[PDB]
């Protein structure tokens, strides 16, 4: 994998992961197996987690998690890049530290007033409770992207992955890199993630879809996508095919749609046909992002779709057995 | 009559800069009609050109503020309405203050120290419009402004408090605070399904406020997204409206009314486990105006049919004008 061969752009959050007890959950009125927005009552909780010794800080956010998992899976130094917005605070410096530890070349845009986005990941057994404060992650501006030191990361990249959620934060950055990729034989990849469905988002998504070589999604996202645009089918295999056959921009040959269904098989539409892949488990939160990261690693290495899906399932199965989107030193995938 | 500050709205205010444009202007800035675009910064040459037009207008906009202004126009009683939201410390913030005062709305804006005021270029040709929005300060509202005694007095004064669902992306603490206050003090709290949430973070915030909503407004597309997101297999808008009205209720709330519009098709209203449907009556961004007309009659203690008819009247007036504007006085009975 060449230097900066894969780039991601998104909404970075510093994940503050810690194994907690009943007293902590009751104190901040947080229930397990649910992701809530941080309120004024939850803001001092980030200080309490920071004050603990066994705390793990991770350069998170869905896209950044995928880029880190791709980097871990590739094991080649300098193969990945990432751009997103952070604040000028200690949590921003921790995000810079962890991105460097994960081997990702991160060029963050520093907002002058917004604190860095954070996410408390409270762990008990195999259960999590996410409390997110997006804050600076929503302030990315295309002026950062257009600077020569940051545009060099787009120029270096052969694969550029940006989540659909970023269409609400910086649609000018997505359209700029998507149009650049079509004009310069690069692969543009996106997902069906969205905070909400509004006219502004609908129109921005419609403008980028022709430029997407790959579209990733989960069954719920695919079914919302199909219903929003009037497709009457609820079959995920047919929805994946219809996504792959959306209109194509000039300079884009084909589109591949990859739809995950949790325990049920991964659905892949390509060349007017749908192939389905059963999930293979390892002996005995962040799983979707890890799946995309494993898929991207093999895509970068020019491998086939079955290797891409198997690597995605491997990475997803590793990450689910660890607190947060974390992993061991080296992978063991073939 | 309507008492002082009887109706309050909280939201994301934008100064709408409206003007009739021509083909040359649309081509110049590569703008498509019947399209909503989010701009990261103000396209300064376009804003100056729009300002230099003959029929230009500066309106204190944003979906909720539009509803509050339409309700104030419909009521015609000075001081009956209030509004809170975030603006910047600039000329557009002062124009926003000027237009809110001209519309007769008591606006207590939170002034962000660095973010410019949110703006929206409204480019109108015929019966079509194109919107280019730079939200900027509108997304920086903080509950510290709400909790100040001079601003909390507007909550205390109000009998009806209306907030869009989208405002949960800006200040969920303000929404939850006023929604919980309304349930404890016999006030009516109203919301809409605008920007239906798909993300788990936003879904959990909405789930926490829905038990406090006495009224939920929505359109057919929003209602169908809401139903699909939470696993309801029905696609019938009449049944979806009934299921919304029957969502769990918080302590101190006896019933919920769900109002779903369907464009040309009738207004659907669910109440007391039954669904009543109202054909649209015609005159010889209409949704905000519909809500404003409905709110005006609700403030006057009128029945649901009057509320729906006033909503249709206001919506039919606003569609025949550039942006969410109206004549001096209403003619509704």
Residue numbers in the entry:
A (entry chain A): 3 to 286, 293 to 342
B (entry chain B): 2 to 285, 294 to 342
What does the study report here?
In plants, ADK also phosphorylates cytokinin ribosides, transport forms of the hormone. We discovered that maize and moss enzymes can form dimers upon increasing protein concentration, setting them apart from the monomeric human and protozoal ADKs. Structural and kinetic analyses revealed a catalytically inactive unique dimer.
Of the two selected representatives, ZmADK2 and PpADK1, we only obtained crystals of the apo form of ZmADK2. The small domain encompases β2, β3, β4, β8, and β9 sheets, plus α1 and α2 helices. The existence of the dimer was further confirmed by X-ray crystallography on ZmADK2, and the structure explains why this oligomeric state is not functional. So far, such a dimer arrangement has not been reported for any other ADK. We further showed that the ADK dimer can exist only when both subunits are in an open conformation, as observed in the ZmADK2 structure. When in a dimeric state, the enzyme cannot be catalytically active as the rotation of the small domain and closure of the substrate cavity for catalysis is blocked. Therefore, to be active, moss and maize ADK dimers must be dissociated into monomers.
